Enzyme design. Structure first.
Site, PDB file in Angstrom:
ATOM      1  CB  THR A 259     -58.154  55.169 -10.307  1.00 59.20           C
ATOM      2  OG1 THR A 259     -58.653  56.354 -10.930  1.00 59.20           O
ATOM      3  CG2 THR A 259     -58.852  54.982  -8.978  1.00 59.20           C
ATOM      4  CB  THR A 260     -53.805  58.776 -11.823  1.00 62.04           C
ATOM      5  OG1 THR A 260     -54.797  59.783 -11.607  1.00 62.04           O
ATOM      6  CG2 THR A 260     -52.813  59.273 -12.843  1.00 62.04           C
TER       7      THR A 260
ATOM      8  CG  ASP B  20     -53.267  56.136  -8.092  1.00 56.29           C
ATOM      9  OD1 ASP B  20     -53.614  56.338  -9.271  1.00 56.29           O
ATOM     10  OD2 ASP B  20     -54.021  55.664  -7.218  1.00 56.29           O
TER      11      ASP B  20
ATOM     12  CB  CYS C 225     -57.759  54.940 -18.362  1.00 60.11           C
ATOM     13  SG  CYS C 225     -57.208  53.428 -17.594  1.00 60.11           S
TER      14      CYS C 225
ATOM     15  CB  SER D 144     -61.067  58.606 -10.529  1.00 57.12           C
ATOM     16  OG  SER D 144     -61.401  59.828  -9.901  1.00 57.12           O
TER      17      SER D 144
END
Lengths: 240, 211, 224, 227, 204, 195, 219, 227, 203
Positions: free
Chosen positions: E1-2, E17, E128, E130
């Site tokens: 989730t990057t 990703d 933004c 995880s």
């Protein structure tokens, strides 16, 4: 027909009859002095059995610093006063300060304008001289119509015989006017408008603001105007 | 009172050039006791696009009939059978139409739109549609997905079995579902191997381990 | 939908004023120690019991009302009059002032003129009663306006009926002396000379609660 | 004479308030659209008689979406309300279904808004596009009749352009074939000269499936072929 | 989730990703974290997948209307203020999302950040997700704003690789998009990057 | 949290704030943020709280005052402006949370320079100093030591240098950057300084 | 806050104590818990004193309005049949233990309403905190068809028993007779034994350390 | 509001004629500014500021000088100033003049299409800024139509003043030259009284008025130019 | 709640009443942010209300009470007596029954040629505690009841009443911690009012 429809000339019908309906009503005089705004009135006398000492229905109170002199349908006048008192108080409840009259006539002419635009209801046969004092631009005197086109003034004479009484203020009015000199000035135009030479004193009512940093806003008794009526006898600020 | 239960089941999706394979199991298991061994979990919509699901049957018979309503309303208003790309976006808003109370039923969208183009859409229970070459959904999600992962994507140094014909691949899905009934509980016995070729769909069945 | 007219006057209001100009005469006169009201009760026969049909009703323990028009409207305006005497009494624990009450009923009558598809009220009211600021006797007009009268009549032929009050009334009259000048304004005004317990009279009764005078009580004054 | 009500019928089986607007659409600027086998080409006038106008703020060929262009006639103040509504539902369709809306499904909704029973919309359009199944051209009316046209004309001079297209339309005409044809009908009914400012053609090709307004530079190379 | 953002002298490099997790099980590996809101503005999801994919696509309905109702290109500031105001209605509704809008408006290369509570904060180096804190460290370690695209797109791969290896949330294929002055370019997937190896032993 | 230091002199009003934009309990999204809400009528609203609620309320009260400043050609009075936003905060309390903290400052010829403090709840009151957030517990005391009457406008900048430096040493989260909104003689400059 | 109620041969006598509280302190030594519904019907309620204000005044005017609609005096079963219609919808909102009753066309009734909505006729009852102490001496000396004087000393002893045997009580005791003729608002047994008299200290007048005196002479 | 048997609208054409009995107002575009002009009348020795009857603001960069019913502008401006600020709250940008004019035109159009509502008997003209540094003076009619202009005029006998402006309108002018062109439009009020014409110079995104001092220096030059 | 403490005490002399209130508005419970927050308001020239409790309702109820009074005040030429005003507060608080209006008002003023004391207490719900003697409400009502019990004479002078209410507040404020510094006492006579601000303990 109804107020929603226009006319081929471009004017309206219901708002045009209301402009004429106030012409058959008693006169009211407005006057801005160098001490405070003053107002005039004409109690129409249906008979001599009215109280004539405690009340008068031509000048009302909007707030502790805003007051108007109504002229027109006395029945429909009580609604706008009951509507302007709320706007003069809802502004205090929302901004913790007095409401400027320039922001009051806009709040009240829109309630008239809203009737001559939709709803299919009759307009308000009322027009009044509303004046007051404010910290932004001092004393003021506005004037509304049944259409809503308000405008500022210095002296106005709506009701019956407007064009004659307004002409009196074209010459006799001065830029500098004291409170006592302004009352005598507004007393003659209130009397000669009814084609008389002296008021019976069981007639016309006057009001005045004259903010002494607290906005006293005193009204007049039948005995207080006797001294003003007597001063008209000696110094006659005649018809001309 | 919890209004969310899981009836259990699975749906397996595969692709290729001009074929998609959707297979399920008809065990409509209740809380812990198997009730009926026959309850189809795949329903055809068009002549080239079916749908599989595995959540509670309350949010499946409704979701399959609601989709048949909004797809039949579209065919008689455009006179053209919808593709999969349009039907994939259609379920994206139906599942999001109830964001506060989501449909406890994951789904599978398979079919062919172009001349070959075997596409397969799978997503979660909220409405995030994502295209995939292969997917598994249901009670045997975590048990079949890694098996299928060793056939399409590779980890071997030698990329074995490059070709993929419909004949051998059909026996592969039967091998995976049989591998699910032995290790998973909720995997049923009666299977429906739906194969969507260029001309239409098949209703190839198979009865597995009644356990 | 009671629109305007090219002369600058409501035509439906002028028509409504003709209805109160042809009904039973109502008459109220204030005094220095109370207010009195009277109404010529046109008894058609002896079947109508006097204790049912009335022209003097109460609003509170100190407010009296008089009707002068459409008898069917003698109750709807009364229901909203008593309701306003309760809504003011709930918030403010004291009694409802007459000026505070008459300005609400005048606003209710007003809203039945500007609203589309409605009919103006076919009656004229006469609200009277003891107040903490003296006595009062108001008159409500079907147009919506109200006057702070002292002595007035609103029924049939009031142009000459008020003439008795313009010449036989003083500013300082007691309530007992004003009764005979009110009866004279009813018996000696027009027909209805057989005034024998056929006149309803309410009084403020010198700051006491509102008292509806009985037939035998008025008989003591009916001998003159 | 029955004209008070809006929904009154006629003893001969006809409407009345709708028929009043039937003549109101014959006062706007003329327009003409041709649906060929390769796309749809539109055309219109530009009554910019007063030279003080900006000449770009007033347009007769707005866009319903990137794939559907349309014309206007009649009340220009009411035509924008239907176009703004069409720009919502066609875009709202793209949010629900990923494919572009069909004109048969778009003209049917642009006609249902002219069934307010306010007043009927006095406006006729020439909605055209290349949505699916090749290019289609539709012509709506205030009465709600949606008739798919191959080549039609709307405006104050729509009568003369009607018979001209009947004697000029051929099924095997390409873009450049009809582009000159879309101007010869405008050269007939015109109180001016076909300059590079009065004409505002635009077309939707079948290849890119999008519309492209023919600017001042591109129309100069087409108005000088002298049909 | 990057997710990433750069805002160079040239366009803004956006790189993400493609790992959509669910508890302790990877759901899929091909989730497109880059959604084209318009031809010039492309958003970027994070956190909840369907929680914002709808609203990012819902913005496409409002954006495409203003591109036709006013025949002009909308600003990124306007596209960001819409999402910050349509998220207050579901602020306490349990949603969870973070979007990084970016594009080319009338003036400069604007960029914004939009969350559930409405944190409309602009800037230049957003990230933004995880495993986002790791990627928000590699960039600040080597950032100069005058990096040419040939030596700057490698930074986006290196910023994700060092943020997808130290974190267990992100993973899978690595996407990287570069916004142009009129559109946007593309680079699709890496899937396995040995930026620090010679096939000897595992590092620590 | 964030600090919102405000100080009212006799002929000037200064406002101080943190230019940090805390996202979560770990990272800072951006340095040199935007917390002030400048108004045309010599009024500088300054909010403090969660960035999301700190933004919408800053804009719901800015346009609602610019609208009033245009519906009448006059400018809103500072005494009326402070009690207006307090009413909106009390209005947005029984329905929505709105965890914000504000400092209202302005100027008007009828009463001189004013300054108004508030809270999460509606706790409007005219003051001469005061702060907000967690940083108020270390700066609301230093202001009392250097608040002699008839302060020149240049004196308050030295007070904040004697105040910001204390926040850099004894606060949990050492805020280095700071923004100042001086309101000296109908001019609103911005002497934002670090350390 | 013990409120006793009983019925005599022709009238109903109510009675209570004038001492409200807040739990650990005394609110005031004089707060008449009795009320005025009309001329022939009185009320007295216990529980929260705040909700009793808009339940008595609301009932006083609604009965007065209904009294002016008709001509007869109001009846005691009409008012109790109106509070339950409002008390049920406020089952956890409005809480009150009201005791009321007066003379009417029927005999002198005395209803006891509960906070949840329950209400029934009762010839003698006691509501309040120390209501148990009031009902204790009541059940031992309650004869049937007693005189007004026979009920006056009974309700006086019924409250006095709830005065000494209870903490949430005290102050004077006021009673009322609701006969058909008129009412009475008497306050007997105002505990004048005076165990100890106070000694107020009038402080001297030096100053009280006052820095500002902004005296104003507004009329 | 219904149609006419031939195709017009008796409720709109009446309202459009109602603006003809009103004070004239003329606007003129330039390179990077747009000076406005209006001609009113007042009773002498009374009504000091005329409560700023014309040249109403809407934002920091959007002036508005209506014409027609003076009382019907308050509801039109208050329903506009609210929308000019609401746009700033939802798009975080000062409302462009293209959006305000598209809103004022939609307000008047929403009043004639609906039933039982009198149309806005007021024709306006809005002069502001677009999103880029541009200036496009718009002009809306009570019918709902709107179009940009390089110069425009509305009010009593607007045809004779717009016709004069069509001839000597240069392309780009000077701040004083553009004022002189607008001040050469006193072809409505006889004797060119300085207490009648009011002009404002909208420049660099900041509106400002024009003092009567420089008015006399420019209004007196016109009398010495007719000979 | 015990948040943003404050107290209001009303006394009733022979023919002149008096009120007093603290001025230390606290941000949190144990904090001080302002010492110039008066808790008494001039609702009329013969009606003075004293509010106490949370500041989110002290200012809100004062704005509502002013809007309801000023609207009613202009419908009659005469002023508003306390009798009709005290019953209004019991209606506003009850209308806002299941509303958070956390205030404990105090209404003092002449009942009216004559002049009466007329003090009245209230609760959070609206129980009109009528009291012809001293009155008090606030968060420090416990340390004021007994304080104004052994120091209250029935009828007192105009200046003598001010000394009684001075020691009644300065002894209670020094005993409580949240109701801090400041004491704007307000003694008022039918023709003169007195606004004195005592010098309390600034701790």
């Amino acid at each position: 027909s109804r107020t929603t429809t226009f006319s081929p000339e471009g004017r309206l019908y219901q708002v045009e009859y209301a402009l004429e309906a106030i012409n058959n009503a008693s006169i009211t005089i407005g006057l801005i002095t160098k001490d405070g705004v003053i107002l005039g009135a004409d109690k129409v006398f249906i008979s001599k059995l009215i109280d004539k000492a405690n009340n008068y229905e031509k000048i009302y109170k909007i707030d502790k610093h805003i007051f108007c002199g109504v002229a027109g349908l006395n029945a429909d006048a009580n609604i706008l006063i009951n509507q302007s008192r709320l706007y003069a108080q809802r502004y205090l409840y929302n901004y913790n300060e007095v409401q400027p009259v320039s922001q009051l006539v806009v709040q009240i002419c829109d309630i008239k304008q809203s009737y001559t635009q939709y709803g299919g209801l009759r307009p308000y046969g009322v027009s009044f001289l509303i004046g007051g004092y404010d910290t932004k631009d001092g004393y003021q005197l506005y004037h509304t119509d049944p259409s809503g086109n308000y405008s500022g003034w210095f002296a106005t004479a709506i009701g019956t015989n407007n064009l004659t009484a307004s002409s009196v203020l074209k010459q006799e009015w001065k830029n500098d006017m004291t409170l006592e000199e302004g009352l005598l000035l507004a007393l003659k135009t209130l009397a000669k408008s009814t084609d008389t030479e002296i008021p019976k004193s069981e007639k016309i009512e006057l009001a005045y603001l004259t903010n002494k940093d607290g906005e006293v806003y005193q009204k007049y008794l039948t005995e207080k105007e006797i001294e003003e009526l007597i001063k008209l006898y000696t110094q006659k600020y005649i018809k001309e | 009172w919890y209004p969310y239960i899981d009836n259990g089941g699975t749906v397996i999706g595969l692709t290729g050039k001009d074929y998609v394979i959707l297979a399920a199991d008809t065990r409509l298991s209740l809380s812990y006791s198997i009730y009926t061994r026959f309850c189809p979990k795949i329903s055809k919509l068009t002549d080239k696009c079916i749908i599989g699901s595995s959540g509670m049957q309350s949010d499946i018979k409704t979701l399959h009939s609601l989709l048949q309503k909004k797809i039949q309303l579209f065919v008689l208003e455009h006179s053209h059978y919808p593709d999969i790309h349009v039907i994939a976006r259609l379920l994206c808003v139906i599942l999001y139409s109830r964001r506060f109370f989501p449909y406890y039923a994951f789904n599978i969208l398979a079919g062919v739109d172009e001349n070959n183009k075997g596409v397969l859409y799978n997503y979660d229970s909220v409405g995030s549609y994502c295209e995939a070459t292969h997917s598994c959904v249901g009670s045997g999600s975590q048990l079949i997905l890694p098996i299928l992962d060793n056939r399409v994507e590779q980890k071997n140094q030698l990329i074995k079995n490059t070709n993929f014909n419909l004949g051998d691949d059909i026996n592969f899905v039967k091998d995976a579902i049989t591998s699910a009934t032995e290790r998973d509980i909720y995997t049923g016995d009666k299977t429906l191997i739906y194969v969507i070729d260029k001309m239409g769909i098949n209703v190839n069945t198979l009865d597995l381990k009644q356990d | 939908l009671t629109t305007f007219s090219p002369t600058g006057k409501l035509v439906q209001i002028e028509y409504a004023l003709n209805r109160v100009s042809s009904s039973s005469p109502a008459l109220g006169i204030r005094a220095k120690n109370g207010v009195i009201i009277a109404t010529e009760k046109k008894s058609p026969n002896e079947l109508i019991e006097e204790n049912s049909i009335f022209k003097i009703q109460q609003i509170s323990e100190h407010i009296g009302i008089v009707y002068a028009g459409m008898p069917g409207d003698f109750r709807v305006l009364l229901k909203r009059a008593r309701k306003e005497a309760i809504r003011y009494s709930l918030q403010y624990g004291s009694e409802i002032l007459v000026k505070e009450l008459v300005k609400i009923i005048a606003s209710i009558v007003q809203e039945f003129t500007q609203t589309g598809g409605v009919r103006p009220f076919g009656l004229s009211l006469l609200i009277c009663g003891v107040d903490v600021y003296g006595y009062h006797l108001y008159q409500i007009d079907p147009s919506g306006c109200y006057f702070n009268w002292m002595a007035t009549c609103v029924g049939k032929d009031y142009q000459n009926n008020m003439s008795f009050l313009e010449k036989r009334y003083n500013k300082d009259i007691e309530i007992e002396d004003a009764i005979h000048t009110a009866i004279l304004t009813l018996k000696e005004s027009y027909e209805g000379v057989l005034n024998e317990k056929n006149i309803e009279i309410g009084v403020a009764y010198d700051n006491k609660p509102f008292k509806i005078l009985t037939q035998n009580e008025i008989k003591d004054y009916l001998i003159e | 004479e029955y004209d008070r009500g809006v929904n009154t019928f006629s003893p001969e089986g006809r409407l009345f308030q709708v028929e009043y607007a039937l003549g109101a659409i014959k006062l706007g600027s003329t327009a003409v659209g041709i649906c060929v086998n390769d796309g749809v080409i539109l055309a219109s006038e530009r009554r910019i008689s007063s030279t003080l106008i900006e000449k770009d703020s007033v347009e007769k060929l707005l866009s319903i979406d990137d794939h559907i262009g349309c014309a206007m006639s009649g009340l220009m103040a009411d035509a924008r309300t239907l176009i703004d509504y069409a720009r919502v539902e066609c875009n709202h369709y793209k949010f629900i279904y990923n494919e572009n809306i069909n004109i048969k499904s778009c003209v049917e909704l642009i006609s249902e808004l002219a069934l307010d029973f306010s007043r009927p919309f006095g406006v006729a359009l020439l909605i055209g596009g290349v949505d699916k199944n090749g290019p289609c051209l539709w012509y709506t009316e205030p009465s709600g009749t949606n008739t798919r046209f191959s080549a039609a004309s709307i405006g104050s001079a729509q009568e003369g352009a009607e018979l001209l297209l009947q004697e000029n339309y051929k099924k095997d005409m390409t873009f450049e074939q009809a582009e000159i044809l879309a101007l010869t009908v405008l050269r007939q009914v015109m109180e001016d000269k076909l300059s590079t400012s009065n004409v505002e053609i635009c077309a939707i090709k079948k290849s890119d499936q999008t519309f492209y307004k023919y600017n001042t530079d591109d129309i100069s190379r087409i108005i000088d072929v002298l049909p | 989730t990057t997710t990433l953002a750069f805002k160079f002298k040239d366009g803004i490099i956006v790189a993400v990703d493609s790992r959509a997790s669910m508890g302790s099980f990877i759901s899929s590996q091909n989730v497109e974290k880059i959604i084209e809101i318009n031809k010039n503005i492309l958003g970027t999801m994070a956190g909840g997948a369907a929680d914002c994919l709808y609203w990012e696509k819902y913005l496409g309905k409002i954006i495409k209307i203003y591109e036709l109702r006013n025949n002009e290109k909308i600003s990124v500031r306007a596209a960001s203020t819409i999402l910050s105001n349509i998220l207050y209605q579901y602020k306490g509704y349990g949603l969870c999302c973070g979007i990084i809008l970016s594009g080319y408006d009338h003036t400069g290369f604007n960029m914004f950040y939009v969350d559930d509570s409405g944190k409309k904060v602009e800037g230049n180096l957003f990230s933004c997700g995880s495993g986002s804190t790791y990627a928000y460290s590699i960039l600040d370690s080597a950032y100069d704003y005058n990096l040419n695209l040939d030596q700057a797109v490698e930074l986006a791969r290196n910023a994700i690789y060092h943020a997808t290896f130290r974190d267990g949330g992100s993973g899978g294929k690595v996407r990287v998009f570069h916004i142009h002055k009129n559109g946007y370019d593309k680079i699709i997937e890496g899937e396995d990057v040995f930026d620090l190896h010679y096939h000897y032993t595992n590092p620590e | 949290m964030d600090t919102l230091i405000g100080l009212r002199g006799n002929n000037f009003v200064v406002l101080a704030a943190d230019t940090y934009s805390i996202n979560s309990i770990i990272k800072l999204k951006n340095d040199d943020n935007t917390k002030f809400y400048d108004i045309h009528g010599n009024k500088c609203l300054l909010l403090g709280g969660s960035i999301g609620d700190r933004l919408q309320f800053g804009e719901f009260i800015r346009k609602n005052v610019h609208l009033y400043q245009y519906q009448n050609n006059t400018d809103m009075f500072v005494k009326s402006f402070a009690f207006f936003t307090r009413k909106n905060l009390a209005y947005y309390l029984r329905r929505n949370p709105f965890e914000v903290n504000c400092l209202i400052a302005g100027y008007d010829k009828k009463d001189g320079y004013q300054l108004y403090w508030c809270d999460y709840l509606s706790n409007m009151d005219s003051v001469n100093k005061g702060a907000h957030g967690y940083g108020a517990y270390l700066v609301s005391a230093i202001l009392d030591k250097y608040y002699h009457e008839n302060l020149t406008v240049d004196e308050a900048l030295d007070i904040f240098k004697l105040c910001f430096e204390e926040l850099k040493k004894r606060f949990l989260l050492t805020q280095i950057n700071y923004e100042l909104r001086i309101m000296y003689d109908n001019k609103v400059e911005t002497q934002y300084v670090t350390v | 806050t013990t409120i006793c109620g009983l019925v005599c041969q022709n009238a109903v006598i109510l009675g209570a104590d004038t001492r409200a509280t807040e739990g650990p302190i005394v609110a005031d030594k004089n707060c008449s818990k009795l009320h005025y519904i009309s001329k022939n019907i009185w009320c007295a309620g216990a529980g929260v004193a705040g909700d009793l204000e808009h339940t008595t005044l609301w009932l006083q005017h609604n009965v007065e309005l209904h009294r002016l609609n008709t001509n007869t005096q109001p009846r005691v079963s009409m008012c109790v049949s109106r509070l339950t219609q409002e008390l049920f919808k406020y089952q956890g909102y409005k809480v009150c233990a009201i005791v009321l009753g007066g003379v009417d066309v029927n005999g002198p009734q005395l209803y006891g309403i509960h906070p949840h909505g329950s209400s029934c006729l009762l010839p003698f009852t006691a509501l309040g905190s120390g209501s148990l102490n009031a009902m204790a001496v009541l059940e031992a000396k309650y004869r049937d068809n007693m005189t007004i004087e026979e009920g006056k000393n009974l309700v006086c002893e019924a409250i006095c028993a709830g005065i000494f045997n209870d903490l949430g009580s005290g102050g004077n005791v006021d009673i009322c007779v609701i006969t058909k003729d008129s009412y009475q608002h008497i306050r007997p047994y105002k505990e004048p034994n005076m165990r100890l008299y106070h000694l107020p200290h009038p402080t001297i007048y030096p100053k009280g350390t006052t820095p500002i005196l902004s005296e104003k002479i507004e009329y | 509001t219904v149609f006419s048997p031939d195709g017009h609208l008796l409720q709109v054409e009446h309202a459009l004629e109602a603006v003809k009995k009103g004070g004239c107002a003329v606007a003129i575009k330039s390179s990077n500014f747009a000076v406005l002009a209006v001609e009113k009348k007042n009773i002498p020795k009374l009504q000091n500021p005329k409560t700023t009857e014309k040249l109403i603001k809407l934002d920091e960069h959007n002036c508005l000088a209506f014409a027609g019913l003076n009382a019907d502008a308050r509801v039109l401006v208050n329903k506009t100033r609210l929308e000019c600020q609401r746009y700033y709250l939802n798009m975080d940008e000062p409302a462009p003049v293209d959006y305000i004019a598209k809103y004022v035109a939609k307000v008047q159009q929403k009043f004639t299409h609906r039933g039982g509502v009198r149309p806005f008997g007021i024709a306006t003209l809005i002069a502001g800024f677009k999103n880029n540094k541009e200036i496009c003076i718009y002009q809306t009619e009570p019918s709902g139509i709107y179009a940009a202009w390089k110069a425009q005029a509305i009010g009593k006998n607007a045809k004779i003043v717009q016709e004069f402006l069509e001839k000597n309108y240069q392309e780009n002018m000077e701040q004083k030259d553009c004022i002189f062109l607008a001040l050469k439009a006193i072809f409505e009020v006889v004797e060119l009284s300085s207490k009648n014409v009011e002009v404002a110079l909208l420049t660099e995104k900041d509106l400002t008025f024009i003092e009567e001092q420089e008015i006399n220096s420019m209004v007196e030059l016109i009398d010495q130019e007719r000979t | 709640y015990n948040y943003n403490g404050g107290c209001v005490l009303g006394m009733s002399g022979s023919n002149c009443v008096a009120i007093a209130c603290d001025l230390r508005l606290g941000a949190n419970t144990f904090t001080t942010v302002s010492t110039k927050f008066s808790k008494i308001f001039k609702m009329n020239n013969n009606v003075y209300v004293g509010l106490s409790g949370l500041a989110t309702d002290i200012q809100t109820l004062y704005e509502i009470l002013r809007y309801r009074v000023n609207l009613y005040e202009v419908r009659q030429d005469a002023e508003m007596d306390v009798e009709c005003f005290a019953n209004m507060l019991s209606s506003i608080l009850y209308s806002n029954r299941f509303s958070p209006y956390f205030v404990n008002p105090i209404v003092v003023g002449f009942k009216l040629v004559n002049y009466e004391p007329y003090l009245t207490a209230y609760d959070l719900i609206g129980a009109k505690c009528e009291t012809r003697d001293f009155v008090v409400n606030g968060v420090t009502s416990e340390q004021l009841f007994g304080m104004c019990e052994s120091l209250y004479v029935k009828d007192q002078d105009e200046n003598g009443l001010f000394e009684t209410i001075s020691q009644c507040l300065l002894s209670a404020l020094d005993r409580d911690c949240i109701s801090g510094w400041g004491a704007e006492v307000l003694v008022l006579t039918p023709e003169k009012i007195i606004k004195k601000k005592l010098k309390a303990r600034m701790d």
